Amino acid sequence: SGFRKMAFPSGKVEGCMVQVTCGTTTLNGLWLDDVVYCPRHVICTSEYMLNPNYEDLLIRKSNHNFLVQAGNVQLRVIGHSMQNCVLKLKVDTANPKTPKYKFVRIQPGQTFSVLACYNGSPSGVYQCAMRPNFTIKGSFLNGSCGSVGFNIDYDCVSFCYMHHMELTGVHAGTDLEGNFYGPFVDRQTAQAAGTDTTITVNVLAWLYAAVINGDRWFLNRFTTTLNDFNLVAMKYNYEPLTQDHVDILGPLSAQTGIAVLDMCASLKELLQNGMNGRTILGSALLEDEFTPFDVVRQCSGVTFQ
Amino acid sequence: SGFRKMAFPSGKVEGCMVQVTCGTTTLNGLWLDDVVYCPRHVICTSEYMLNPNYEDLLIRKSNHNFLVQAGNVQLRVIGHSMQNCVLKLKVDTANPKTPKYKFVRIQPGQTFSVLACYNGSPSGVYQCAMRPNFTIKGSFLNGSCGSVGFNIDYDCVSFCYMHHMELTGVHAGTDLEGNFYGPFVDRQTAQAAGTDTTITVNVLAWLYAAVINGDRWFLNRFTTTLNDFNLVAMKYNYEPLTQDHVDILGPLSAQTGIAVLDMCASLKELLQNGMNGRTILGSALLEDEFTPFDVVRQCSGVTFQ
Numbered sequence: 001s002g003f004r005k006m007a008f009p010s011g012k013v014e015g016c017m018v019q020v021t022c023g024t025t026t027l028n029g030l031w032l033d034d035v036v037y038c039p040r041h042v043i044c045t046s047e048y049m050l051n052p053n054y055e056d057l058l059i060r061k062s063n064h065n066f067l068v069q070a071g072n073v074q075l076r077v078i079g080h081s082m083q084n085c086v087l088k089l090k091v092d093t094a095n096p097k098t099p100k101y102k103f104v105r106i107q108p109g110q111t112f113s114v115l116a117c118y119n120g121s122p123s124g125v126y127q128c129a130m131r132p133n134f135t136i137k138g139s140f141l142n143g144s145c146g147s148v149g150f151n152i153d154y155d156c157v158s159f160c161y162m163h164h165m166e167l168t169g170v171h172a173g174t175d176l177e178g179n180f181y182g183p184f185v186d187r188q189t190a191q192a193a194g195t196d197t198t199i200t201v202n203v204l205a206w207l208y209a210a211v212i213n214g215d216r217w218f219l220n221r222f223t224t225t226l227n228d229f230n231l232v233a234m235k236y237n238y239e240p241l242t243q244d245h246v247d248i249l250g251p252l253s254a255q256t257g258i259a260v261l262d263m264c265a266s267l268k269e270l271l272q273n274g275m276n277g278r279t280i281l282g283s284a285l286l287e288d289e290f291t292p293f294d295v296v297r298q299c300s301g302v303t304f305q
Numbered sequence: 306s307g308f309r310k311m312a313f314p315s316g317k318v319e320g321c322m323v324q325v326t327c328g329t330t331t332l333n334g335l336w337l338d339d340v341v342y343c344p345r346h347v348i349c350t351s352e353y354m355l356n357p358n359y360e361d362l363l364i365r366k367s368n369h370n371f372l373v374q375a376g377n378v379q380l381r382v383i384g385h386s387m388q389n390c391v392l393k394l395k396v397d398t399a400n401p402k403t404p405k406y407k408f409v410r411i412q413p414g415q416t417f418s419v420l421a422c423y424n425g426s427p428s429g430v431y432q433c434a435m436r437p438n439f440t441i442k443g444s445f446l447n448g449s450c451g452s453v454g455f456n457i458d459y460d461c462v463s464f465c466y467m468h469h470m471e472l473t474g475v476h477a478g479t480d481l482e483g484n485f486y487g488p489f490v491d492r493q494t495a496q497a498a499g500t501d502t503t504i505t506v507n508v509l510a511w512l513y514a515a516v517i518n519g520d521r522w523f524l525n526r527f528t529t530t531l532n533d534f535n536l537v538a539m540k541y542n543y544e545p546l547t548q549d550h551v552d553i554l555g556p557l558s559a560q561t562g563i564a565v566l567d568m569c570a571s572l573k574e575l576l577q578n579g580m581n582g583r584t585i586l587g588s589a590l591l592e593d594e595f596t597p598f599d600v601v602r603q604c605s606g607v608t609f610q
């Protein structure tokens with residue numbers, strides 16, 4: 001028993017991190033087979049940090065302008081190209097530590113692990129959710145660009161995020177094909193994140209985790225309808241709940257014998273009256289960065305290798 | 306910027322996890338050079354799960370009773386011995402993935418990462434603190450025994466924890482020499498954790514992290530004395546603050562220009578009046594599982610390789 005913000009083991013990804021230097025800019029890259037992936041703004045110098053034309057900047061470079069290091073070994077760049085906002089650097093050596101992988105684009109509300117890196121070197125791992133406004137609430141310092149987000153399925157690493165920029169306290173990036181999450185661009189403009197909402201299906205999953213772990217004080221006997229719940233969710237900046245979400249919560253409903261709509265009636269009460277000085281799983285706020293699948297995984301015990 | 310419960314990258318430890326089966330009991334072991342370390346209660350069968358004599362149980366075993374698997378490869382046991390509460394299994398092959406390591410015993414209030422494993426297979430990584438009552442608030446299911454806790458110093462893995470048992474919602478274990486943290490034994494008796502307290506130096510470190518990240522609302526102009534603070538800390542089940550703690554907080558005081566005793570005056574107010582519906586770094590409770598060193602590491606950017 002117990003419940004923790006749990007990240008995926010990072011070993012399979014640590015073996016792919018490299019350092020990429022171009023000019024006076026150093027950041028992180030992802031080395032899979034004979035391609036190094038990294039943010040394209042590594043080719044930016046401070047004259048262009050505000051309104052760059054990346055096609056122009058790339059044509060003025062040659063392979064020898066790119067310093068790529070895997071620890072201490074140097075990798076020789078034999079070709080470069082741009083795919084949207086990422087740079088793909090072809091190198092002379094296929095990474096022997098390349099895991100089975102795929103590139104997936106995730107949806108708001110889904111969670112992943114982040115391997116924060118500096119100078120090609122892994123620094124720490126943490127779990128986070130893609131927010132409904134397409135930012136993540138990460139922890140990133142200067143030089144963290146190119147750090148990646150990932151999930152693990154059995155033996156397969158799904159890469160879903162590469163870090164590009166911080167926007168007033170929160171973080172924005174692309175999928176691994178170089179397409180940004182959200183309406184952001186990789187230059188200095190007046191862009192801000194839009195209004196964030198609370199991920200309702202995740203809050204419900206977390207309440208089920210609490211019941212599984214013995215926190216029952218917030219339950220009640222009343223139920224409610226999808227439409228009467230969503231009426232109250234809207235007033236509190238909670239995402240509306242769909243039939244798809246109810247079905248997703250099925251396994252947790254089955255394991256605890258509490259109906260989804262029953263649990264929604266508890267959530268309704270918590271939103272109207274607050275916690276009144278009680279905590280749930282050691283939190284005094286309603287937590288929305290665990291998916292139904294995170295809860296099953298942690299309250300059932302799925303491993304990977 | 307940002308602040309997350311961040312764990313160490315786990316790659317160096319994932320390579321040491323093996324599965325150990327004896328009888329119908331399977332759990333995890335740690336394979337370093339040609340020794341596999343695992344909890345000694347793997348030699349327990351349900352007749353002895355309550356009052357075992359481990360010396361007797363061990364003498365009735367031979368090397369062939371121990372099934373050790375590193376993924377799919379089998380390791381041949383060529384010797385066994387007991388050190389306090391751990392079993393040391395000598396095997397015929399030195400682990401080629403053995404990192405530079407040491408065995409350290411940590412103190413209450415210190416943090417470490419836990420690699421939760423099942424059947425020798427890594428499942429997830431999370432960060433936690435050793436509580437003042439010598440338990441940890443972990444997340445562990447059946448079969449997690451032998452999972453280890455660790456820190457990383459530059460290139461060196463310090464192993465500090467091996468998981469043995471759950472006691473009413475919290476978790477207890479040994480250092481890697483087999484000596485239990487706290488007054489617990491590896492059998493079924495009527496043992497419970499003692500009263501827990503809040504780790505004050507860690508709360509102060511977390512308040513400095515908040516200031517570094519722009520949360521300033523709780524500051525005030527008043528200061529206080531060590532003895533007047535500790536007078537109020539006692540009433541709230543907070544650990545007393547020493548001059549050693551003040552010195553440890555020096556770097557954070559320097560970086561924010563707020564004196565430790567100044568920050569204590571803010572903590573004093575928060576304890577007497579509560580948060581009054583405000584949050585700090587996304588929490589509505591005072592967080593005590595970040596050390597001063599965790600905060601520096603995350604708000605300065607130290608890596609490892």
Ligand SMILES: *C(=N)[C@H](C[C@@H]1CCNC1=O)NC(=O)[C@@H]1[C@@H]2[C@H](CN1C(=O)[C@@H](NC(=O)C(F)(F)F)C(C)(C)C)C2(C)C
Nearest residue numbers: 041140141142143144145164165166167186187188189
């Ligand atoms: C990559 N190495 C850094 C890491 C950033 C900064 C601290 N934490 C992070 O996540 N990223 C950058 O330097 C990117 C890069 C130019 C500027 N930039 C920023 O992150 C800046 N933000 C913005 O561009 C803004 F404000 F418009 F959102 C900064 C002010 C330094 C936070 C480019 C090409 C966007």
Ligand SMILES: *C(=N)[C@H](C[C@@H]1CCNC1=O)NC(=O)[C@@H]1[C@@H]2[C@H](CN1C(=O)[C@@H](NC(=O)C(F)(F)F)C(C)(C)C)C2(C)C
Nearest residue numbers: 346445446447448449450469470471472491492493494
């Ligand atoms: C190791 N594989 C498990 C993992 C435990 C149980 C679920 N979460 C964990 O951390 N550990 C055990 O099976 C140990 C082992 C016998 C019983 N035990 C327990 O954890 C039990 N607790 C106690 O002994 C108690 F209550 F006294 F504290 C259990 C009731 C199953 C939680 C031995 C040798 C202590």
